[PDB]
Design an enzyme around this catalytic site. Structure first.
Site, PDB file in Angstrom:
ATOM      1  N   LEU A 179      15.517  -0.126  -2.560  1.00  0.00           N
ATOM      2  CA  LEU A 179      15.158  -0.826  -1.327  1.00  0.00           C
ATOM      3  C   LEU A 179      14.888  -2.309  -1.616  1.00  0.00           C
ATOM      4  CD1 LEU A 179      14.366  -0.602   1.747  1.00  0.00           C
ATOM      5  CD2 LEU A 179      11.949  -0.505   0.862  1.00  0.00           C
TER       6      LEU A 179
ATOM      7  N   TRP B  75      -3.514   1.008  -3.898  1.00  0.00           N
ATOM      8  CA  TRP B  75      -4.229   2.225  -4.377  1.00  0.00           C
ATOM      9  C   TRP B  75      -3.347   3.132  -5.258  1.00  0.00           C
ATOM     10  CZ3 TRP B  75      -9.138   3.009  -4.754  1.00  0.00           C
ATOM     11  CH2 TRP B  75      -9.618   4.300  -5.009  1.00  0.00           C
TER      12      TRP B  75
ATOM     13  N   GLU C 289      -7.204  -2.261  -7.649  1.00  0.00           N
ATOM     14  CA  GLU C 289      -8.354  -1.534  -7.131  1.00  0.00           C
ATOM     15  C   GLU C 289      -8.823  -0.496  -8.136  1.00  0.00           C
ATOM     16  OE1 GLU C 289      -6.784   0.094  -3.575  1.00  0.00           O
ATOM     17  OE2 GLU C 289      -6.527  -1.848  -2.583  1.00  0.00           O
ATOM     18  N   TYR C 290      -9.836  -0.830  -8.932  1.00  0.00           N
ATOM     19  CA  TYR C 290     -10.556  -2.130  -8.889  1.00  0.00           C
ATOM     20  C   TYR C 290     -11.011  -2.439 -10.327  1.00  0.00           C
ATOM     21  CZ  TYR C 290     -11.648  -0.204  -4.209  1.00  0.00           C
ATOM     22  OH  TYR C 290     -11.600   0.419  -2.992  1.00  0.00           O
TER      23      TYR C 290
HETATM   24  N1  LIG Z   1      -4.680  -1.745  -0.803  1.00  0.00           N
HETATM   25  C1  LIG Z   1      -4.969  -0.433  -0.264  1.00  0.00           C
HETATM   26  C2  LIG Z   1      -3.686   0.382   0.088  1.00  0.00           C
HETATM   27  O1  LIG Z   1      -3.017   0.728  -1.119  1.00  0.00           O
HETATM   28  C3  LIG Z   1      -4.109   1.594   1.002  1.00  0.00           C
HETATM   29  O2  LIG Z   1      -2.972   2.263   1.560  1.00  0.00           O
HETATM   30  C4  LIG Z   1      -2.233   3.135   0.725  1.00  0.00           C
HETATM   31  O3  LIG Z   1      -1.353   2.409  -0.129  1.00  0.00           O
HETATM   32  C5  LIG Z   1      -0.641   3.287  -0.972  1.00  0.00           C
HETATM   33  C6  LIG Z   1       0.195   2.403  -1.945  1.00  0.00           C
HETATM   34  O4  LIG Z   1      -0.764   1.760  -2.776  1.00  0.00           O
HETATM   35  C7  LIG Z   1       0.259   4.201  -0.132  1.00  0.00           C
HETATM   36  O5  LIG Z   1       0.954   5.070  -1.046  1.00  0.00           O
HETATM   37  C8  LIG Z   1       2.333   5.384  -0.691  1.00  0.00           C
HETATM   38  O6  LIG Z   1       2.319   6.488   0.212  1.00  0.00           O
HETATM   39  C9  LIG Z   1       3.652   6.704   0.663  1.00  0.00           C
HETATM   40  C10 LIG Z   1       3.728   7.622   1.900  1.00  0.00           C
HETATM   41  O7  LIG Z   1       2.854   8.645   1.551  1.00  0.00           O
HETATM   42  C11 LIG Z   1       4.494   7.290  -0.472  1.00  0.00           C
HETATM   43  O8  LIG Z   1       5.837   7.270  -0.066  1.00  0.00           O
HETATM   44  C12 LIG Z   1       6.435   8.570   0.236  1.00  0.00           C
HETATM   45  O9  LIG Z   1       6.285   9.572  -0.731  1.00  0.00           O
HETATM   46  C13 LIG Z   1       6.780  10.834  -0.275  1.00  0.00           C
HETATM   47  C14 LIG Z   1       6.930  11.770  -1.490  1.00  0.00           C
HETATM   48  O10 LIG Z   1       8.103  11.506  -2.235  1.00  0.00           O
HETATM   49  C15 LIG Z   1       8.087  10.855   0.578  1.00  0.00           C
HETATM   50  O11 LIG Z   1       7.948  11.886   1.566  1.00  0.00           O
HETATM   51  C16 LIG Z   1       9.258  12.262   2.081  1.00  0.00           C
HETATM   52  O12 LIG Z   1       9.640  11.701   3.353  1.00  0.00           O
HETATM   53  C17 LIG Z   1      11.048  11.916   3.530  1.00  0.00           C
HETATM   54  C18 LIG Z   1      11.845  10.837   4.270  1.00  0.00           C
HETATM   55  O13 LIG Z   1      12.955  10.543   3.438  1.00  0.00           O
HETATM   56  C19 LIG Z   1      11.260  13.355   3.990  1.00  0.00           C
HETATM   57  O14 LIG Z   1      12.610  13.582   4.366  1.00  0.00           O
HETATM   58  C20 LIG Z   1      10.867  14.195   2.750  1.00  0.00           C
HETATM   59  O15 LIG Z   1      10.959  15.596   3.065  1.00  0.00           O
HETATM   60  C21 LIG Z   1       9.558  13.783   1.974  1.00  0.00           C
HETATM   61  N2  LIG Z   1       9.602  14.189   0.557  1.00  0.00           N
HETATM   62  C22 LIG Z   1       8.585   9.519   1.221  1.00  0.00           C
HETATM   63  O16 LIG Z   1      10.035   9.386   1.261  1.00  0.00           O
HETATM   64  C23 LIG Z   1       7.927   8.318   0.503  1.00  0.00           C
HETATM   65  N3  LIG Z   1       8.094   7.025   1.181  1.00  0.00           N
HETATM   66  C24 LIG Z   1       4.504   6.337  -1.637  1.00  0.00           C
HETATM   67  O17 LIG Z   1       5.017   6.984  -2.799  1.00  0.00           O
HETATM   68  C25 LIG Z   1       3.045   5.990  -1.892  1.00  0.00           C
HETATM   69  N4  LIG Z   1       2.845   5.376  -3.197  1.00  0.00           N
HETATM   70  C26 LIG Z   1      -0.554   5.031   0.864  1.00  0.00           C
HETATM   71  O18 LIG Z   1       0.261   5.743   1.839  1.00  0.00           O
HETATM   72  C27 LIG Z   1      -1.444   4.081   1.656  1.00  0.00           C
HETATM   73  N5  LIG Z   1      -2.325   4.864   2.528  1.00  0.00           N
HETATM   74  C28 LIG Z   1      -4.988   1.225   2.236  1.00  0.00           C
HETATM   75  C29 LIG Z   1      -5.455   2.404   3.135  1.00  0.00           C
HETATM   76  O19 LIG Z   1      -6.168   3.222   2.262  1.00  0.00           O
HETATM   77  O20 LIG Z   1      -6.109   0.436   1.804  1.00  0.00           O
HETATM   78  C30 LIG Z   1      -5.392  -0.645   1.208  1.00  0.00           C
HETATM   79  O21 LIG Z   1      -5.750  -1.861   1.661  1.00  0.00           O
HETATM   80  C1  NAG Z   2      18.616  -6.783   4.651  1.00  0.00           C
HETATM   81  O1  NAG Z   2      19.426  -7.320   5.682  1.00  0.00           O
HETATM   82  C2  NAG Z   2      20.778  -6.868   5.566  1.00  0.00           C
HETATM   83  C3  NAG Z   2      21.613  -7.688   6.549  1.00  0.00           C
HETATM   84  O2  NAG Z   2      21.042  -7.406   7.842  1.00  0.00           O
HETATM   85  C4  NAG Z   2      20.752  -5.355   5.929  1.00  0.00           C
HETATM   86  O3  NAG Z   2      22.042  -4.788   5.924  1.00  0.00           O
HETATM   87  C5  NAG Z   2      19.814  -4.599   4.989  1.00  0.00           C
HETATM   88  O4  NAG Z   2      19.653  -3.281   5.468  1.00  0.00           O
HETATM   89  C6  NAG Z   2      18.438  -5.264   4.972  1.00  0.00           C
HETATM   90  N1  NAG Z   2      17.608  -4.562   3.952  1.00  0.00           N
HETATM   91  C7  NAG Z   2      16.351  -4.160   4.188  1.00  0.00           C
HETATM   92  C8  NAG Z   2      15.661  -3.466   3.050  1.00  0.00           C
HETATM   93  O5  NAG Z   2      15.706  -4.300   5.267  1.00  0.00           O
END
Ligand SMILES: N[C@@H]1[C@@H](O)[C@H](O[C@@H]2O[C@H](CO)[C@@H](O[C@@H]3O[C@H](CO)[C@@H](O[C@@H]4O[C@H](CO)[C@@H](O[C@@H]5O[C@H](CO)[C@@H](O)[C@H](O)[C@H]5N)[C@H](O)[C@H]4N)[C@H](O)[C@H]3N)[C@H](O)[C@H]2N)[C@@H](CO)O[C@H]1O
Ligand code: NAG
Ligand code: NAG
Length: 383
Positions: A55, A84, A125-126
């Site tokens: 990404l 976090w 943190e932290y």
């Molecule tokens: N500074 C503090 C913040 O950190 C804090 O907020 C938190 O931040 C953390 C990051 O530091 C966040 O952690 C992220 O949480 C994400 C969502 O939970 C995680 O991403 C996801 O992980 C999943 C497991 O692989 C995936 O789930 C899938 O979804 C699919 C879509 O393709 C679905 O089809 C599938 O079946 C699922 N397996 C997903 O794809 C993925 N994006 C990420 O890994 C994680 N590190 C946290 O969410 C957030 N709350 C804040 C509030 O506490 O305070 C802050 O200021």
């Molecule tokens: C960045 O912009 C290009 C051109 O619009 C787009 O195709 C791509 O999906 C964008 N990527 C993200 C991560 O938003």
């Protein structure tokens, strides 16, 4: 001259259906500073870790974000390191020696140049937190890292900003933060005045209360936004460096079996881990603002909504489920209070959880409140 600081989550693009939120969804003109979250640090080499390279890099996430400056040149686009999920141990390890700090500083400088960022937000943190892989010497060594970053940024000559996201509990400040010296080196202190209560604490409560409630005692007594910001001031941070965080999300709970008392402080089923996951964020104990308003504010909602008269936050419940959060009334109270105190501005965790689709009413309702108040407000000289 006030700030509206918008954290942007790079993982929000994976939320399904109307939860999907990408770079193109950021309402850039409502913010003065926008922070791409998160990069991390490598365990072994103390370099910048790109956490979702497909990404962030292959689909040009970093660059799409920073090139928003073409159409919005007055806005600053920075990146946050840490968060976090990154944990604290790699950071405690990175700052342990001058040589490993300088490796990270060089890596940061290359990364900011490569992706055309305006600077860096430190979100370890932290420092000092034993529960997060930290130790006593982090307090000095975090300050050294900040001083060393600032000097590198100066040498680069591009006027980059350096900011930090920080907690407001006294013990965390004592363990991790040399307040006067940090406040001098940083352009802004993004205070995380939220997650102040939650399933981990063992009772139901709103998570960003503005003022003390009668049930607040011992460690909780001053753990509210007003007294926490006052603590930053008392410890030596100038008013015009402090930016007050506003959560665009709720902390939820599953109440204990047979518990018919929905009042603040009521006992919970702690092993549930929080309220049941909502459909877009899918995280126990954690609901985006738009997940809350679509359930609580509909005409036929079976949720009961209440108001914490001291903390000035809404909460709502139904059956075993209970959630405390921010709504337009509570956010407006906090905006007025920010201006009354003379703080540098408002911050949100996070812009991707506002009602950006207008599922409940007007689009971007919460960030519009931050923008409305802050853009008409002049930050006064330090108090
Ligand atoms: N500074 C503090 C913040 O950190 C804090 O907020 C938190 O931040 C953390 C990051 O530091 C966040 O952690 C992220 O949480 C994400 C969502 O939970 C995680 O991403 C996801 O992980 C999943 C497991 O692989 C995936 O789930 C899938 O979804 C699919 C879509 O393709 C679905 O089809 C599938 O079946 C699922 N397996 C997903 O794809 C993925 N994006 C990420 O890994 C994680 N590190 C946290 O969410 C957030 N709350 C804040 C509030 O506490 O305070 C802050 O200021
Ligand atoms: C960045 O912009 C290009 C051109 O619009 C787009 O195709 C791509 O999906 C964008 N990527 C993200 C991560 O938003
Ligand atoms: C939601 O998260 C749960 C619990 O972590 C997990 O089992 C499931 O795969 C997730 N569902 C979706 C749709 O992502």
């Amino acid at each position: 001259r006030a700030r509206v600081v918008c954290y942007f989550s790079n993982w929000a693009v994976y939320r399904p259906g109307v939860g999907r939120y990408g770079i193109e969804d950021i309402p850039v003109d409502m913010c003065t500073h926008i922070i791409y979250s998160f990069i991390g640090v490598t365990e072994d080499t103390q370099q910048v870790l790109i956490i979702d390279p497909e990404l962030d890099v292959d689909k040009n996430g970093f660059k799409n974000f920073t090139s928003l400056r073409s159409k919005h040149p007055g806005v600053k686009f920075t990146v946050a390191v840490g968060g976090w999920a990154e944990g604290g141990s790699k950071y405690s390890k990175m700052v342990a020696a001058k040589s490993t700090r300088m490796a990270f500083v060089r890596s940061v400088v290359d990364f900011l140049n490569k992706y055309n960022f305006d600077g860096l937000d430190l979100d370890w943190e932290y420092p000092g937190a034993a529960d997060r892989g930290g130790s006593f010497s982090d307090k000095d060594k975090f300050l050294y890292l900040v001083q060393e970053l600032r000097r590198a940024f100066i040498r680069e000559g591009k006027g980059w900003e350096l900011t930090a996201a920080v907690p407001l509990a006294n013990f965390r400040l004592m363990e991790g933060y040399h307040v006067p010296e940090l406040c001098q080196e940083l352009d802004a202190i993004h205070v995380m005045s939220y997650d102040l209560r939650g399933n981990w604490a063992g009772f139901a409560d709103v998570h960003s209360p503005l003022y003390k409630r009668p049930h607040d005692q011992w460690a909780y007594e001053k753990l509210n936004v007003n007294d926490g910001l006052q603590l930053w001031e008392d410890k030596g941070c100038p008013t015009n460096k402090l930016v007050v965080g506003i959560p665009f999300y709720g902390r939820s709970f599953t109440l204990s079996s047979g518990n018919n008392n929905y009042n603040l402080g009521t006992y919970i089923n702690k092993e549930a881990g929080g309220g049941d996951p909502a459909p877009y964020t899918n995280a126990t104990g954690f609901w985006a603002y738009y997940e809350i308003c679509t359930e609580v504010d509909t005409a036929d909602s079976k949720w009961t909504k209440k108001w914490d008269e001291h903390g000035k936050c809404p909460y709502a419940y139904k059956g075993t489920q209970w959630v405390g959060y921010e709504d337009p009334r509570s956010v407006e109270i906090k905006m007025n209070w920010i201006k009354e105190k003379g703080y540098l501005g408002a911050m949100t965790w996070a812009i991707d959880m506002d009602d950006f689709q207008g599922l409940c009413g007007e689009k971007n309702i919460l960030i519009k409140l931050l923008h409305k108040h802050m853009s008409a407000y002049t930050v006064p000289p330090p108090r």
